[PDB]
């Protein structure tokens, strides 16, 4: 037959689609695990989906992924109340079997599965607490405490009178009865969470609204028959308006520039100017824009001042994001903005950066970006190096400056590797500055080559 | 204006013995929280 044929590989693929969904169910993937399941025929594949979730819960690999598992079942239950109807039936029989088998591993697998079904309003309260009576009839205490850690949140919200009486009966055992040792600290841990109020047992995937889940609170008990419809999991033979205004005005960036300029101009000292900037609590994406205003306020002066340098150091030693805005601004000043600046403004820049480089608020490795070349050195860029290095010589002294230029590996300033016309350029640069003592290593390499 | 600034404040017992630095500020002359007045000292080149 081709009709018995077609209905079998249709029955095969429906099996072969649900099982990779159930294996690939995780948090932040529930709605997509629900999407590809909804296009699969759940109504025909009714025990195909029931046997895939019950076996995957029980495997003891899971136990962590139970709160994601029941969240799909609640997505099923509001779509179809009949899907979770049989799926709530089998988990009752699974416990009633394995409790009479005394299977503590497989019971507590189901016992965490049923409690999160109650948290997701799949099952009633009466099915849960009547399990809690049959567990509290014998010992079974390593099972029943793991239930009441998870289920006791919602259950004390709904059925608080009966649920206290269970707490009332359970408390009789710890006080006036001898028990085993290792289970004893499990019994009193259940009373330790009562006073901390269950804030470590109520986190999960409530991914339906309290009305978006059509509330099919099934009123089962574990004392009734549940019909065991295993005959569906086999094969059978069916004869069946925002207005997007572009803003070119940039009033916002002008109004923020006035606020920062006024913080600076109202301050006596740079310690008190940095305090007011740190008080504003500027966002991370605006901090590069703040270092840019501070430098442009400083170049409007006639001379350098310690105010802008003292203020800058207070921001860098506050938090490492202000450190990053100063490392980013030093490259913007050298690579983009050099052409814009007049010679009087390059005195204030090189003394500003050379002061922060010499007291180590910037690394000496920030000078790595600088490359001395006939072709790729700006005339206004070379005026920046002279003013930055005159400041480094004055603060450190020349003998201390040779220690730090040796410790860094900056090749564009001091090339020892070749290209002998560039070695000619650098020695000629630094002796014009007044630093021939720095050049003496490069002077050896040139006479060898010529 | 010279006195809308925040004034530096420190522990007075320690300050007589060693320079403590600036750890606290007190208020100078009162204004609204957003509303600063510039000070003459920021407009004068220092002698050095």
């Amino acid at each position: 037959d081709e009709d018995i044929k077609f209905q079998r590989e249709n029955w095969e693929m429906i099996r072969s689609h649900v099982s990779p969904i159930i294996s690939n169910l995780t948090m932040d993937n529930l709605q997509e695990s629900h999407r590809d399941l909804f296009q699969v025929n759940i109504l025909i594949g009714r025990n195909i989906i029931c046997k895939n979730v019950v076996d995957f819960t029980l495997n003891k690999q899971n136990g962590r992924l139970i709160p994601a598992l029941s969240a799909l079942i609640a997505l099923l239950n509001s779509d179809i109340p009949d899907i979770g109807e049989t799926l709530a039936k089998e988990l009752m029989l699974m416990f009633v079997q394995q409790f009479n088998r005394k299977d503590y591993v497989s019971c507590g697998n189901i016992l965490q599965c049923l409690s999160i079904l109650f948290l997701y309003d799949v099952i009633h309260e009466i099915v849960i607490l009547q399990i809690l009576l049959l567990l509290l009839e014998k010992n079974s205490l390593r099972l029943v405490i793991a239930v009441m850690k998870i289920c006791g949140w919602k259950l004390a919200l709904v059925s608080k009178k009966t649920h206290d009486m269970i707490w009332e009966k359970l408390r009789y055992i710890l006080q006036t009865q001898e028990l085993s040792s290792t289970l004893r600290e499990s019994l009193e841990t259940l009373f330790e969470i009562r006073q901390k109020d269950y804030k470590s047992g109520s986190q999960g995937l409530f991914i339906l609204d309290p009305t978006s889940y059509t509330v099919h609170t099934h009123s089962y008990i574990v004392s009734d028959e549940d019909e065991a419809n295993k005959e569906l999991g086999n094969f059978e033979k069916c004869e069946n308006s925002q207005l997007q205004i572009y803003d070119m005005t940039s009033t916002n960036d002008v109004e923020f520039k006035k606020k920062i300029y006024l913080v600076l101009k109202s301050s006596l000292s740079g310690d008190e100017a940095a305090h007011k900037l740190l008080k504003l609590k500027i966002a991370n994406n605006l901090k590069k824009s703040v270092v840019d205003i501070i430098i442009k306020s400083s170049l409007q002066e006639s001379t350098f001042s310690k105010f802008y340098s003292i203020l800058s150091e207070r921001m860098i030693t506050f938090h490492r994001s202000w450190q990053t805005a100063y490392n980013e601004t030093f490259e913007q000043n050298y690579t983009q903005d050099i052409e814009d600046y007049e010679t009087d403004q390059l005195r204030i820049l090189g003394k500003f950066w050379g002061h922060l480089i010499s007291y180590e608020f910037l690394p000496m490795d920030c000078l790595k970006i600088i490359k001395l070349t006939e072709e790729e050195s700006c005339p206004q860029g070379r005026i920046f190096i002279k003013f930055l290095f005159q400041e480094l010589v004055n603060e450190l002294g020349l003998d201390e400056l040779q220690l730090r230029l040796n410790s860094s590996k900056l090749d564009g300033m001091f090339p020892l590797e070749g290209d002998a016309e560039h070695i000619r350029y650098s020695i000629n640069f630094f002796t014009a500055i007044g630093l021939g003592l720095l050049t003496e290593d490069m002077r050896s390499r040139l006479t060898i080559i010529q | 204006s010279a006195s809308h600034i925040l004034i530096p404040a420190s522990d007075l017992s320690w300050s007589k013995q060693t320079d403590t630095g600036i750890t606290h500020f007190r208020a100078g002359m009162t204004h609204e929280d957003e509303k600063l007045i510039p000070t003459i000292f920021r407009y004068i080149t220092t002698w050095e």
Binding site: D271, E272, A274, H275, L278, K279, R314, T317, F318 | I7, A9, S10, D11, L12, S13, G21, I22, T23, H24, F25, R26, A27, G28, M29, T30
Partner: peptide, 27 residues
């Protein structure tokens, strides 16, 4: 807390006496 910092009063002072800890002070 007061912690030995501040004016004894804001009465002869012409100020309000409001003190704040400096955020630019590293420690």
């Amino acid at each position: 807390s007061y912690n030995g910092i501040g004016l004894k009063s804001a009465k002869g002072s012409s100020t309000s006496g409001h003190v704040q800890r400096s955020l630019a002070s590293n420690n």
